[PDB]
Paper text:
The type IX secretion system (T9SS) is a large multi-protein transenvelope complex distributed into the Bacteroidetes phylum and responsible for the secretion of proteins involved in pathogenesis, carbohydrate utilization or gliding motility. In Porphyromonas gingivalis, the two-component system PorY sensor and response regulator [name] participate to T9SS gene regulation. Here, we present the crystal structure of PorXFj, the [name] [name] homolog. As for [name], the PorXFj structure is comprised of a [name]-like N-terminal domain and an alkaline phosphatase-like C-terminal domain separated by a three-helix bundle central domain.
In this study we produced and purified the [name] [name] homolog (Fjoh_2906, called hereafter PorXFj) and solved its structure by X-ray crystallography at 2.0 Å resolution. Similarly to the recently released P. gingivalis PorXPg structure, PorXFj displays three distinct domains: a N-terminal [name]-like RD (residues 2–121), followed by a three-helix bundle domain (HBD, residues 122–205), and a C-terminal PglZ domain (residues 206–517). Two PorXFj molecules are present in the asymmetric unit. While not activated and monomeric in solution, PorXFj crystallized as a dimer identical to active [name]. The putative binding site of the metal supposed to stabilize the phosphoryl group is clearly occupied by an ion that is octahedrally coordinated by the carboxylate oxygens of D11 and D54, the main chain-carbonyl oxygen of N56 and three water molecules. Despite the absence of BeF3 that mimics the activating phosphorylation of the RD, the side chains of the two PorXFj highly conserved ‘switch’ residues T82 and Y101 are oriented towards the active site, in a conformation corresponding to the active state of RDs. The active site coordinates two Zn2+ ions: Zn1 is coordinated by the catalytic T271, D237, D414 and H415 residues while Zn2 is coordinated by residues H364, H499, D360 and a water molecule.
Numbering used by the authors:
A (entry chain A): 2 to 429, 434 to 517
B (entry chain B): 2 to 428, 435 to 517
C-alpha cells in the first residue's frame, strides 16, 4: 500500500532526517550502504523507486543503476549525490536517470521528485479534468461570439489545445462535452464561410492568407533572406491536430521560428488547393494562363502532374533566380530513395517535396478494416500519425536537411474530416464538393456557388455550379444511396467546409 | 547557436549570480520581473525554456505557466520557487511542469535541469551506444554457449532488451552488430530445434511448455485458485517484442504476477498452434479424437472454426465445472461490441477472447503500400503495435475486466518474422506439407514421418518442411514473382525466436 524506496548511499546513516521526513509522508524506506547489497535487495524485493549515491566505495551509483535497469527497466531511479561535475551529470542523464539531486538536498526536493516520478500521470489527469470543468462554459461563450477569421483561428487553437489535453482523461462525459463544442464550432464556421467567402475575392478585402497567396507571401520572404537553403515540404492532407501530434518529435531536429495558420481555398481538394500553392493562381486563372497544365474534374488522369512547371513559372514570375527542384513522393520506396540521395541537392536554394502518405492513409480508412481499427477515432488517428512520422522516410529526409543546415518550411494543402451524416445529391468522385451543370442537392447542407468564376473557379461550361458540404455531411448520390451511406459513413473526406479541412498550418524552422 | 532562457522572478536582481553562472555555460538569459511582461516576451520571441517563480505580485508563476502553455505547449517550463507546499508541487506537476526546484537552489542544480530537459535524448543515444559497444562481445560469447531451451529464453530476453534499447541510436556499425546477433541467434536456434524437437515428444522428456500443454499447465492452476474470474486473451501472432512495446501501457490497469515464455508447436501457424491451445492435443490427436472439427491443409474453409468446442471438451476432460464462454474477434465492430457488453459476463469463471487484429495487420504489410510505410522495419512495427493497443477495443475489454476484478491471462499462439531469403520448393511461406516435396535440405527442418511430431499424414509419402532463419519457401514455377512480392514480408509457420518463443502472462487487477 505504501510506496517502497530503496536508498543506496555509503553515508546513509548521515541521512536519517530525510528518511524520517519520508516515513512521515507514508513512504517505506529500505537503506543500503553498498551497491552490491542494494542489488541483492532489489532482486529479492519489489521497490517502486531507487535513490542512488554516485560516489561510494566499491560499486558506483552508475554501475549499480546499470545492473538494476537490466533487471527491472520500468522502475525509476534517482541520483542523490555531492557530485557536481558535468561529465557525471551527462553520464547519469544518458543512463536514463529519472532525476539528479545535488547534496545537501532539501527533503522537500526529494518529495517533489517522488511525486513527479510516481504520481504525475494521475495529477495531470486530475488537473486537466478540473481545468476543463472550469473552462468549457467559457469555450461555449467564446464560440457564440466568434465573428471574424482571426477569432476562428484562435477558437480552433483553443479547441485543439483542449482536445490533445483531454484525449487521455477518463471522464467520458467531459470528452462528449468537448465533442459537442467541436460540432457546434463546425456548424458556425460553415455559416461564417458561406457568408464571407465570396466577399474575400473583392478588391482590397480583409481576408486571410489562402492557397494561392501562400508561396508569394510566406515562402518568398524566407527565400529573400538568403541565409540558408530551404526544404519546402507540403504534406498533403495534414489536419492541424496531426501536426500538433508530432510537433515535439520534430523539435529534436528543428526549432520552430514562425507559425502561421492559413485558410485553404474551396474546394479543400488537392487538384485545386495544392495546384494553387505551386502556381500562386486561383484555379480559374490556372485554366486561363496554363491550359496545357490545368485539368478540370471531367478530364482523365492525374490532377497534380504539373506542379514543378507551375512552381517554376511562379518563381520566374516573382523575379527569383534560384536553384530549385521538385519531388513528389507517392510511396515508401520513393521516399526512401530521396532520403538516401538527399546530399545531391546540397547546392540547391529550394527543394520542394510533396508527400502524399497522410492523404493515402486518410483514404485507406474507407478501404481497409485494419485502418478502421488503427484510426477508429480522432485520438487513434493522431496516435497513428505520430507512429508514422517517427518512423517515416519524410523524417529521414528532414534529418538529412538538418545536417546540411537547411531551413525547413512545413505546410499542407488542406485537412480532412470524419463524415457522419448523408446529404442527397444528383449529379454526374468527391464526397465533400461537387461540380456540374444541373446539380440536385439539399440547400441547407451545402454552400452553393452558382457562378464559380466569382470565387476563382473554372465553370466547365456556362451553367456550371459548385456545392461544398458543410458540417460533417457527405454528398451521397440518390442512385445507390443506402450503399453510399453504409460505405462512406465514418470515413475521412475532404473538399468542403470545416475547421479540420480549411484552417491549416504553415511552419518555418531553423536547424538545431 | 545558444539556448535561450526566459527567467521570470520578482526578485530577479537577487538572482544575478545564477544568471552569470549560466551565461558562462553559453546560455542566453532574458529576465522579467512579472508574469505579464514574461508572457509578452514569450509571444514575441522563441525561447527554448522558461524558468518561473511561483510567488510574484500580480500573476502567479502557475497563472503565467498556464498562459504560456496555451500559447506554445511544446516549450519546457521549470518552476524555481521558495514554495514547499505539497499542493503547489501537485498543481505544478499536474500543469506539466518539466521540473520544480526549491530555493535556495544550487546553480549546478539549474544546470542539471537544463541538460536533462534539453540534451537528454542525445546523451541517452551516446550512453546506450557505448554501453552496447562494451557489451556486444559478451552477447556473442553467450550466444555461442547456449545449449538448452531455458538458455534460449534467457538469450532471447537479452536480445529483446538491447533491441528496444538500441532502436533510436544512429551508429550503423552497432545497429548491424545487433542485427548480426539476431540472425546468428535464429541460425543457432534453428539447429537447436532441428535437434531436440522430435526428442521432446518422447515419454518424460525434458521439454518446455508447448501449445498443447499451455491450458492444462498454466491456465488450469489459475482457475483452481478460484478467488477471481479469468479473462483469457489470445492475441494471435504476437511477437515477444510487441508485448514488450505495450507492457508499460497495460501496467496502468494490471500488475504482472507471472511471466512464462513458452514454445509454440511446429508449424507456428494458427490452424495448428492455436487449435492445440484450445484442445490441449497435438494436431494428430485432434484429427484422431475430433474428425468432425479438425481440418487438414487440403480442406476448404476456416481452419479455427471449432475452438469453443475444442475448449469445452478440454475443460470437461480436465474435470472442471466452470462457467465459461468463448469469443473470436475478427474486426473492429465485433471488438467494440464485446467491450460494450462485457458486463454481461461478470458472473463467468472464464472468458476466452481470441483477437485476430495483429495477425491481419502483419499480413496487410505484404499487399498494402500504406502498411509498408507504417511497419517498414521492426521498430516501426512495434511503434504501430503500441499505437494500436493504446486505442484498441481489446484495451477497452481489458479495462472492463479490470473494473470487474478479473484476473488477466494474456498470451498468443505464435509470433512472425520478416523473411528476406528465398528457398526453392515444388508441390504458407514458412512451412509446407504434401506428398513428395522438392526443397533445399539446408534451409528447412524436414520431418518425413509427421506422426512422430504429433502431426497428420496420408501414407509414408507425405512430409512436413519448416523454414529456418529468415527463409521463405518460393514455388519454382513462379519463382521471380514470389521472390519480388514476398521478400521483406512478415511470415510465420517455421523456426525462429520471433515465431516460436512467446509470452504467457498472468496479471492481477490494480
Ligand atoms: Mg558517497
Ligand atoms: Mg517571488
Ligand atoms: Zn491534398
Ligand atoms: Zn484525399
Ligand atoms: Zn495465429
Ligand atoms: Zn498469419
Amino acid at each position: 500500500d505504501k510506496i517502497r524506496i530503496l536508498w543506496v548511499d555509503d553515508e546513509i546513516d548521515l541521512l536519517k532526517p530525510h528518511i524520517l521526513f519520508l516515513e512521515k509522508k507514508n513512504y517505506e524506506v529500505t537503506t543500503s550502504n553498498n551497491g552490491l547489497d542494494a542489488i541483492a535487495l532489489f532482486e529479492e524485493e519489489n521497490f517502486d523507486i531507487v535513490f542512488l549515491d554516485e560516489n561510494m566505495p566499491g560499486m558506483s551509483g552508475l554501475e549499480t543503476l546499470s545492473e538494476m535497469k537490466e533487471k527491472k527497466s520500468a522502475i525509476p531511479m534517482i541520483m542523490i549525490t555531492k557530485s557536481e561535475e558535468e561529465y557525471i551529470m551527462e553520464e547519469a542523464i544518458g543512463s536514463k536517470i529519472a532525476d539528479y539531486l545535488i547534496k545537501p538536498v532539501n527533503p522537500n526536493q526529494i518529495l517533489l521528485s517522488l511525486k513527479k516520478n510516481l504520481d504525475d500521470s494521475r495529477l495531470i489527469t486530475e488537473k486537466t479534468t478540473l481545468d476543463y470543468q472550469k473552462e468549457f462554459r467559457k469555450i461555449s461563450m467564446e464560440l457564440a461570439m466568434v465573428n471574424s477569421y482571426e477569432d476562428w483561428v484562435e477558437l480552433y487553437k483553443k479547441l485543439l489545445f483542449w482536445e490533445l489535453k483531454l484525449e487521455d482523461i477518463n471522464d467520458q462525459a467531459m470528452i462528449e462535452i468537448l465533442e459537442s463544442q467541436k460540432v457546434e464550432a463546425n456548424s458556425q464556421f460553415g455559416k461564417y464561410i458561406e457568408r464571407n467567402y465570396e466577399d474575400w475575392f473583392a478588391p482590397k478585402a480583409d481576408k486571410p492568407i489562402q492557397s494561392h497567396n501562400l508561396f508569394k507571401e510566406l515562402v518568398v520572404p524566407e527565400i529573400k533572406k538568403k541565409d540558408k537553403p530551404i526544404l519546402f515540404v507540403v504534406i498533403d492532407n495534414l489536419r492541424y491536430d496531426q501536426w500538433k501530434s508530432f510537433e515535439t518529435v520534430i523539435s529534436n531536429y528543428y526549432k520552430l521560428e514562425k507559425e502561421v495558420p492559413y485558410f485553404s481555398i474551396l474546394p479543400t481538394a488537392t487538384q485545386y488547393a495544392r495546384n494553387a500553392i505551386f502556381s500562386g493562381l486561383m484555379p480559374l486563372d490556372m485554366e486561363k494562363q496554363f491550359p496545357q497544365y490545368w485539368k478540370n474534374d471531367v478530364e482523365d488522369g492525374g490532377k497534380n502532374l504539373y506542379e514543378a512547371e507551375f512552381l517554376s513559372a511562379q518563381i520566374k514570375r516573382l523575379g527569383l533566380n534560384i536553384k530549385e527542384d521538385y519531388f513528389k513522393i507517392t510511396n515508401y520506396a520513393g521516399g526512401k530513395k530521396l532520403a538516401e540521395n538527399f546530399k545531391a541537392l546540397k547546392g540547391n536554394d529550394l527543394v520542394t517535396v510533396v508527400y502524399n502518405f497522410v492523404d493515402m492513409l486518410s483514404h485507406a480508412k474507407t478501404e481497409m478494416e485494419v485502418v478502421k481499427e488503427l484510426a477508429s477515432d480522432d485520438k487513434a488517428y493522431r496516435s497513428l500519425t505520430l507512429s508514422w512520422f517517427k518512423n517515416s522516410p519524410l523524417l529521414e529526409i528532414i534529418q538529412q536537411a538538418q545536417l546540411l543546415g537547411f531551413k525547413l518550411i512545413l505546410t499542407t494543402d488542406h485537412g480532412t474530416i470524419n463524415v457522419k451524416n448523408p446529404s442527397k445529391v444528383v449529379g454526374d468522385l468527391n464526397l465533400r464538393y461537387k461540380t456540374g451543370r444541373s446539380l440536385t442537392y439539399e440547400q441547407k447542407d451545402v454552400y452553393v456557388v452558382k457562378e464559380p468564376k466569382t470565387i476563382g473557379l473554372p465553370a466547365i461550361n456556362m451553367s456550371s455550379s459548385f456545392i461544398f458540404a458543410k458540417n460533417d455531411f457527405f454528398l451521397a448520390y440518390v442512385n445507390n444511396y443506402n450503399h453510399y451511406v453504409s460505405y462512406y459513413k465514418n470515413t475521412y473526406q475532404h473538399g468542403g467546409i470545416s475547421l479540420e479541412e480549411m484552417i491549416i498550418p504553415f511552419l518555418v524552422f531553423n536547424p538545431k
